[PDB]
Design a protein around this ligand. Sequence first.
Ligand SMILES: CC(=O)N[C@@H]1[C@@H](O)[C@H](O[C@@H]2O[C@H](CO)[C@H](O)[C@H](O[C@]3(C(=O)O)C[C@H](O)[C@@H](NC(C)=O)[C@H]([C@H](O)[C@H](O)CO)O3)[C@H]2O)[C@@H](CO)O[C@H]1O
Ligand SMILES: CC(=O)N[C@@H]1[C@@H](O)[C@H](O[C@@H]2O[C@H](CO)[C@H](O)[C@H](O[C@]3(C(=O)O)C[C@H](O)[C@@H](NC(C)=O)[C@H]([C@H](O)[C@H](O)CO)O3)[C@H]2O)[C@@H](CO)O[C@H]1O
Ligand SMILES: CC(=O)N[C@@H]1[C@@H](O)[C@H](O[C@@H]2O[C@H](CO)[C@H](O)[C@H](O[C@]3(C(=O)O)C[C@H](O)[C@@H](NC(C)=O)[C@H]([C@H](O)[C@H](O)CO)O3)[C@H]2O)[C@@H](CO)O[C@H]1O
Lengths: 114, 114, 115, 114, 114
Amino acid sequence: EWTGDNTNAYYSDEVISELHVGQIDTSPYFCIKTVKANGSGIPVVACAVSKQSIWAPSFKELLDQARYFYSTGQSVRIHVQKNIWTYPLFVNTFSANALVGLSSCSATQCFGPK
Amino acid sequence: EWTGDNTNAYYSDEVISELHVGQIDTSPYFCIKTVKANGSGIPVVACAVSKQSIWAPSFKELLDQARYFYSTGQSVRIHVQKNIWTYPLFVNTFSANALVGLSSCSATQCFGPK
Amino acid sequence: EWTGDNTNAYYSDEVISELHVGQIDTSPYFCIKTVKANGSGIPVVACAVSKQSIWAPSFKELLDQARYFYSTGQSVRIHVQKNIWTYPLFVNTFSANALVGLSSCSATQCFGPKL
Amino acid sequence: EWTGDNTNAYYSDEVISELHVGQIDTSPYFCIKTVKANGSGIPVVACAVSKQSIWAPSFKELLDQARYFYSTGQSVRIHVQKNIWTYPLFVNTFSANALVGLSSCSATQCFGPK
Amino acid sequence: EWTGDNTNAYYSDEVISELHVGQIDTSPYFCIKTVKANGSGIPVVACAVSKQSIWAPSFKELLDQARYFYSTGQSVRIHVQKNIWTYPLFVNTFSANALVGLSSCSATQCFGPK
Ligand SMILES: CC(=O)N[C@@H]1[C@@H](O)[C@H](O[C@@H]2O[C@H](CO)[C@H](O)[C@H](O[C@]3(C(=O)O)C[C@H](O)[C@@H](NC(C)=O)[C@H]([C@H](O)[C@H](O)CO)O3)[C@H]2O)[C@@H](CO)O[C@H]1O
Ligand SMILES: CC(=O)N[C@@H]1[C@@H](O)[C@H](O[C@@H]2O[C@H](CO)[C@H](O)[C@H](O[C@]3(C(=O)O)C[C@H](O)[C@@H](NC(C)=O)[C@H]([C@H](O)[C@H](O)CO)O3)[C@H]2O)[C@@H](CO)O[C@H]1O
Ligand SMILES: CC(=O)N[C@@H]1[C@@H](O)[C@H](O[C@@H]2O[C@H](CO)[C@H](O)[C@H](O[C@]3(C(=O)O)C[C@H](O)[C@@H](NC(C)=O)[C@H]([C@H](O)[C@H](O)CO)O3)[C@H]2O)[C@@H](CO)O[C@H]1O
């Protein structure tokens, strides 16, 4: 598996605008929300769950990087894999997207797979 | 179990006004005080105890995130489980609430379960 | 044991003015110096030593919190247990106080145990 | 082995301009892009992959340090070992370079091996 | 052994002016250069190596603390033990000093052993 696989999805020129942390089924987790820097479109919601999904190993790295980008407000590309989380109240609160990568963007390009 | 279970309680549009770290019965713990951003109402007090309860795996994640929202003074929703801690002077000094989650509320609604 | 046991000691409305990191007898340790915000009294010194004393599990947490409070310079309540470290040159330079807790304070009250 | 081995390569007076985090084959990884501080030259790209290559022990240290130098935009020397990652798509997106060290540079000199 | 031992050396009112991180013989390491805050004297260079010397257990604490004092530019007392590192090319790039302590200072008074 790889962040860059074309079976994942991504959204460029987004800014992390909200951040949540909690626990589910003994697993710490966090979710983020991103919105287009230019105000268009609809928000992206993704979560990482510390001991769930193939993406479990990068939980801490993605949490630290999400916090960094959240506090700077900079434009990023968010990479997710859709339809991973299944608990209905959780999905309805947040989404089913697993968070699989974050890429800083310049005004012209984003530094990550495309 | 989940931060968002309806057996837990939450308070929206709060700010983290105080933070304390200590140790009890060989376990690191922290507690936070929150108050409504607009000044109304009464404070909320909650603690996490590193080695205790089903919420123990989330101790570090919650301490890190509590420190961040405390340093910004931004609006948050705090999620708690009532009536778990037992040592009477600890309960009386702080509370029996376990901290089970923290959501940012930078928008109309808080980014978390309700 | 508990940070708030009345056999421990505490000092309210203190500013963490200095911070030191070193190693003693295989253990990383740190010490802080604190002074009353209002300028009165004498400094308090206290140290935490990794894997030594009953307070060892809280070492990393205390160091991170002490760093944060040092960087802001805000008024805090410092909680210690007296007469813990016995290395005589170490005590002479710093003290025998084990750091056991740190509480933020508003101008009117500190968020931590008293008595 | 050593960062400073002459079989490694290094580029002086660079700025870390972009940062990416993701996961590959169970390994969280990060990549950085750097450019000459004066605006000349061609970018350098390098990645560190957790639990992969002889450089795995230093993964967290290099991630923390690259985050710091990325946040200050200060001039640095980046040290790499070439032709380490073999996944062709990954190499094509990023580089085959393993990141092996980072040195601050003054106006006069870089504080590291040459 | 103690940071404050007779047989160690120290240099007061110094500013961390450079920082480097790398790896050697499977061990991550970092080095710092310091200069007198008032501009006098000759630089000091010291390194810490995670799996080596009797000071190995304090590697992470000293790295974190060096980073913090580096980022603020404030005046410190640096404590070293001479003649520790042995790989000649390493000593030639940096020095043989093992880093063994950091003490903050104020107006020509440092909080550490003298
Ligand atoms: C920017 C915007 O909201 N709307 C359109 C825009 O769709 C369109 O071109 C876009 O230009 C941006 C600049 O980086 C991107 O290149 C868009 O491609 C991607 C993206 O990177 O965001 C690629 C990606 O595969 C898509 N993801 C999915 C699941 O389909 C996303 C996604 O559709 C959007 O990001 C969601 O808003 O788009 C690229 O489409 C230009 C017309 O050229 O006009 C803007 O206003
Ligand atoms: C509710 C509304 O649409 N408009 C206002 C509103 O400003 C306010 O009501 C409170 O506003 C917030 C909106 O962010 C919440 O909806 C409050 O409900 C909760 C809360 O989220 O804080 C729900 C939660 O279940 C409750 N917890 C418990 C244990 O009961 C808390 C709690 O009761 C209070 O937070 C304690 O202060 O409230 C909602 O009450 C009021 C202000 O008077 O006026 C509406 O018109
Ligand atoms: C007025 C002006 O800017 N002239 C530059 C000229 O200075 C520059 O030469 C480079 O000068 C810097 C000074 O720090 C270095 O000494 C360069 O040497 C190295 C480097 O440290 O970057 C050595 C290194 O071994 C080389 N790496 C490899 C794999 O060979 C690199 C590498 O060639 C360059 O960094 C790539 O740009 O150079 C020294 O080359 C040159 C190039 O920057 O351009 C003039 O305009």
